[PDB]
Amino acid sequence: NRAAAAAQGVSFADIRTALASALSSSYVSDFPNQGRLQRVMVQADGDA
């Protein structure tokens, strides 16, 4: 509901980020692992 979401502070883009990190993985940064760069991914616990 547009009206309900606007009544609170939810901005429909915080929703985008929240869902994209909760129900799917999120690619945030990159780190070195014995000489080669590899991804950092936040995906949320499987129980939720």
Next chain:
Amino acid sequence: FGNVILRANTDGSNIYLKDVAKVGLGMEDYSSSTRLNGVNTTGMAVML
């Protein structure tokens, strides 16, 4: 698009996009136009 909330007031009524602007379908540019014998027509130019 006219029901886009610009600001939400504590009373419950919001200031909508339709309150300050007119929303409708148009064109992304208005540069040129063509007529064939004085009648407005849609035209394309094919360059080799």
